[PDB]
Amino acid sequence: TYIPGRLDGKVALVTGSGRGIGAAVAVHLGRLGAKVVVNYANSTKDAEKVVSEIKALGSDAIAIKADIRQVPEIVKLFDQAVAHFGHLDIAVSNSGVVSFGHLKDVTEEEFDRVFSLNTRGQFFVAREAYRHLTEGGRIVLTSSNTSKDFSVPKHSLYSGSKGAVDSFVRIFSKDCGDKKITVNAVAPGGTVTDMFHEVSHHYIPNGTSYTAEQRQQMAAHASPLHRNGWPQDVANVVGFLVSKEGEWVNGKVLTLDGGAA
Amino acid sequence: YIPGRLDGKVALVTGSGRGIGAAVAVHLGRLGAKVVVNYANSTKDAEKVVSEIKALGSDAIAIKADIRQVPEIVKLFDQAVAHFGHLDIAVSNSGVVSFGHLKDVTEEEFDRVFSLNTRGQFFVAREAYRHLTEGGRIVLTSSNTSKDFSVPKHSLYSGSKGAVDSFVRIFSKDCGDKKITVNAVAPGGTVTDMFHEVSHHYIPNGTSYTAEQRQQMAAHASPLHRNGWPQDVANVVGFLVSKEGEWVNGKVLTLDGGAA
Ligand SMILES: NC(=O)c1ccc[n+]([C@@H]2O[C@H](COP(=O)([O-])OP(=O)(O)OC[C@H]3O[C@@H](n4cnc5c(N)ncnc54)[C@H](OP(=O)(O)O)[C@@H]3O)[C@@H](O)[C@H]2O)c1
Ligand SMILES: NC(=O)c1ccc[n+]([C@@H]2O[C@H](COP(=O)([O-])OP(=O)(O)OC[C@H]3O[C@@H](n4cnc5c(N)ncnc54)[C@H](OP(=O)(O)O)[C@@H]3O)[C@@H](O)[C@H]2O)c1
Ligand SMILES: O=c1c(O)c(-c2ccc(O)cc2)oc2cc(O)cc(O)c12
Numbered sequence: 219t220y221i222p223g224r225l226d227g228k229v230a231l232v233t234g235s236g237r238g239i240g241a242a243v244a245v246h247l248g249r250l251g252a253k254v255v256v257n258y259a260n261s262t263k264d265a266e267k268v269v270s271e272i273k274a275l276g277s278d279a280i281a282i283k284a285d286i287r288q289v290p291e292i293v294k295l296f297d298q299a300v301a302h303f304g305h306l307d308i309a310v311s312n313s314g315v316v317s318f319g320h321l322k323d324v325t326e327e328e329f330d331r332v333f334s335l336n337t338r339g340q341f342f343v344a345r346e347a348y349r350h351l352t353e354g355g356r357i358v359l360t361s362s363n364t365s366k367d368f369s370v371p372k373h374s375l376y377s378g379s380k381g382a383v384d385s386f387v388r389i390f391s392k393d394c395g396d397k398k399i400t401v402n403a404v405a406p407g408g409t410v411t412d413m414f415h416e417v418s419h420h421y422i423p424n425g426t427s428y429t430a431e432q433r434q435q436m437a438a439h440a441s442p443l444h445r446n447g448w449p450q451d452v453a454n455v456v457g458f459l460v461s462k463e464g465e466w467v468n469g470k471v472l473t474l475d476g477g478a479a
Numbered sequence: 480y481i482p483g484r485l486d487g488k489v490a491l492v493t494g495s496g497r498g499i500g501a502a503v504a505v506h507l508g509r510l511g512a513k514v515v516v517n518y519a520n521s522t523k524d525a526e527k528v529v530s531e532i533k534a535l536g537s538d539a540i541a542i543k544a545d546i547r548q549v550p551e552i553v554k555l556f557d558q559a560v561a562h563f564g565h566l567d568i569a570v571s572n573s574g575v576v577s578f579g580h581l582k583d584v585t586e587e588e589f590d591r592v593f594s595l596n597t598r599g600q601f602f603v604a605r606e607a608y609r610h611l612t613e614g615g616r617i618v619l620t621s622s623n624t625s626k627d628f629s630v631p632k633h634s635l636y637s638g639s640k641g642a643v644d645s646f647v648r649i650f651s652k653d654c655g656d657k658k659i660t661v662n663a664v665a666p667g668g669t670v671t672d673m674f675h676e677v678s679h680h681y682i683p684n685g686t687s688y689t690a691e692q693r694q695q696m697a698a699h700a701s702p703l704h705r706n707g708w709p710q711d712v713a714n715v716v717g718f719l720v721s722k723e724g725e726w727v728n729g730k731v732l733t734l735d736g737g738a739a
């Protein structure tokens with residue numbers, strides 16, 4: 219019985235959904251009615267927990283291990299999703315890594331560590347999603363507010379990895395149009411996950427000398443709403459984008475920073 | 480001292496043997512800068528650019544280096560410094576173009592483009608920061624297809640320049656501790672070998688038009704009713720790298736003659 223904004227009958231796949239923004243995204247698509255493929259690379263136990271979380275709320279989920287840096291595994295990841303659930307309608311490219319360093323000291327190895335996942339990875343998730351998805355499908359990739367809207371010292375490598383994503387999705391929308399598939403990206407600001415705590419200090423002048431609580435409480439004042447971004451905030455937006463009602467939002471980056479910018 | 484001029488400054492330009500790079504190199508020479516001319520394959524053409532720059536009364540040298548290989552960017556920059564004593568201006572221009580529907584884009588094709596257009600440029604900037612003297616200038620090369628122009632089947636190349644757009648905004652923050660400015664020029668359809676390489680992809684049923692019809696059509700994109708030429712890019716690069724250009728920092732200048 220079709221409820222506006224619900225994903226009953228649909229099958230969704232979220233990369234890196236064992237934990238973080240991706241876990242919230244994966245559970246949320248489950249609450250909306252979708253069956254979900256929970257992708258992980260390292261966090262087996264957390265992915266299990268997401269699968270259980272989704273089954274308990276009246277849906278179905280499977281956990282598939284795949285390093286998204288390896289394109290042959292993306293291909294296999296999408297092949298397995300379609301095999302198991304019958305068809306795939308929604309792909310969310312979420313997996314990502316963070317990076318900091320003054321330009322002068324950025325190494326080749328660090329460049330490739332970051333770009334092979336954030337950019338090359340998301341790119342081929344997009345290719346494999348286009349190849350496997352049903353007509354009228356949905357593809358969301360993950361950018362960041364540091365791509366265009368926010369300028370952070372020593373953050374050039376990461377910012378550019380996502381700036382690439384920002385261009386990808388606008389043109390992806392053109393190509394993917396012949397399968398009636400919309401492509402967008404979400405570009406979150408400070409969102410409280412393990413990534414956030416790992417680096418909150420790089421975003422603030424003399425941040426090492428503040429606590430982890432105090433730093434989070436400063437990031438909260440960036441938005442005029444005076445609160446942090448939460449994995450749920452992204453999930454709410456991804457959830458609209460991937461519904462029937464979000465169709466006319468296509469080829470776009472949505473900055474999700476609560477009005478910081 | 481004459482304004483907009485570069486007397487006593489030293490410049491480098493990646494892939495300046497031909498195309499846009501060549502016009503940048505010669506123009507920096509015309510303004511008084513000494514030039515290191517980089518090429519990967521185009522030896523004869525690079526030696527001519529050198530002659531052009533000596534002909535207008537400056538000095539230049541050709542250096543072979545493959546901008547995909549960082550250990551070769553590192554050498555390019557050491558050799559420049561070793562030859563002229565110091566380096567003030569670095570233009571990262573070398574690029575390649577690509578077309579393909581998402582469904583067909585290969586691992587090899589991705590790497591081909593990004594190793595040069597993105598990774599390459601990134602490390603050209605790194606080595607430029609390392610080598611440049613106080614108050615130097617770095618300019619990278621982007622595209623009007625990065626943000627301003629949306630072409631089907633152009634996702635890979637568009638993405639590869641979007642990265643550069645984000646790079647220079649942040650690079651400007653880190654590069655300020657040496658008073659170096661970083662920007663990027665983003666040309667529209669500019670008439671080089673690359674233009675002829677892809678001009679049919681920018682136009683519905685492009686293979687049904689001659690190349691000269693395609694160029695005439697691309698001239699109507701500007702409200703000025705002419706094509707972009709390598710000198711158009713060269714002029715703006717010239718101004719960005721002058722003392723008078725200092726207050727343009729961390730920006731991407733789209734040069735399409737008003738097409739966007
Ligand atoms: N946190 C923020 O404020 C913020 C801001 C802007 C953008 N973002 C973007 O939002 C996305 C998620 O961020 P987050 O904060 O949730 O990060 P996080 O807490 O560090 O989570 C990282 C996620 O990526 C997965 N992952 C890592 N390497 C992988 C690989 N090789 N293959 C497949 N999956 C891999 C991880 O799974 P495993 O545990 O199995 O490795 C995990 O699920 C990222 O793209 C990030 O760039 C976050
Ligand atoms: N022309 C346009 O309409 C247009 C539009 C937007 C952006 N752009 C950008 O503007 C820049 C100039 O391009 P163009 O139009 O002059 O193209 P072009 O005529 O094909 O010139 C390409 C230049 O790239 C150099 N290059 C290629 N591979 C290299 C490598 N591995 N290492 C070092 N150098 C290498 C070439 O040197 P060798 O031949 O010796 O290898 C040559 O000097 C590019 O970055 C392009 O992306 C051009
Ligand atoms: O950790 C973060 C952070 O602290 C801030 C921030 C802190 C204080 C401010 O005054 C303004 C912003 O923004 C962020 C933006 C991101 O995309 C990712 C982050 O991890 C943070």
Ligand SMILES: O=c1c(O)c(-c2ccc(O)cc2)oc2cc(O)cc(O)c12
Binds near residue numbers: 622
């Ligand atoms: O070749 C090109 C081309 O033809 C056009 C074009 C634009 C509008 C038109 O109406 C017709 C053509 O733009 C371009 C933009 C680029 O960055 C690179 C190109 O190579 C072209």
